[PDB]
Paper text:
NSs impedes interferon production through three known mechanisms. A characteristic feature of RVFV pathogenesis is formation of 0.5 μm thick proteinaceous filaments formed by bundles of thin fibrils in the nuclei of infected cells. Here we describe the first high-resolution structure of a bunyaviral NSs protein.
A truncated stable, soluble core domain spanning residues 83–248 of RVFV NSs (NSs-ΔNΔC) was identified using NMR spectroscopy. The structure was successfully phased from the anomalous sulfur signal in a single native crystal and refined to high quality. It is composed of eight α-helices with helices α1-α6 and α8 arranged around a long central helix α7. Two NSs-ΔNΔC monomers constitute the asymmetric unit, with an interface formed by their α8 helices. We therefore conclude the NSs-ΔNΔC structure represents a novel fold. In the crystal lattice NSs-ΔNΔC molecules were found to pack into a highly organized network of two fibril-like assemblies, referred to here as F1 and F2, creating large solvent channels. Therefore, we conclude that the F1 crystal fibril is not only more stable than F2, but that it also represents the architecture of NSs in intranuclear filaments.
Numbering used by the authors: 79 to 244
Amino acid sequence: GAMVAKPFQRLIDLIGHMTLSDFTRFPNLKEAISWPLGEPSLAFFDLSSTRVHRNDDIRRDQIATLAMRSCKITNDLEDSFVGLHRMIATEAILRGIDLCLLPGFDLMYEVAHVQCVRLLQAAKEDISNAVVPNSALIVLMEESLMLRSSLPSMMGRNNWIPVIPP
């Protein structure tokens, strides 16, 4: 059916035009977008943005592939969507994200939402290590500012574990 809201749509649409190296240059941010695939990816942003020109015919295949790679079920497409929905809920519970926002109708949006929450918590740690801001970092700073005033609960728990340098 339809979701009750899509709180991070605007941020998603900004991130969908950025590039992977705008995030991978910062250690905590890199880790933020390395869930759920086990490598840094903007693919869920790309499929969720309202600004990205995509082709509908191949959307369905891309979504299937992303689900299968996330949860590692490849033998049944519907099991893999269940599997990805489970990953979403698992991470959202840890992040303190309200599960009413994530009913599993638009799994691409839901992963990007959870990644946004990860990014906003991760940015604080990179900033307190005095990284050099780029426009990706500034966008995250601005969204946090807006939320601290509007609806601080949308950012979840302040429980990001800092990445340790190699």
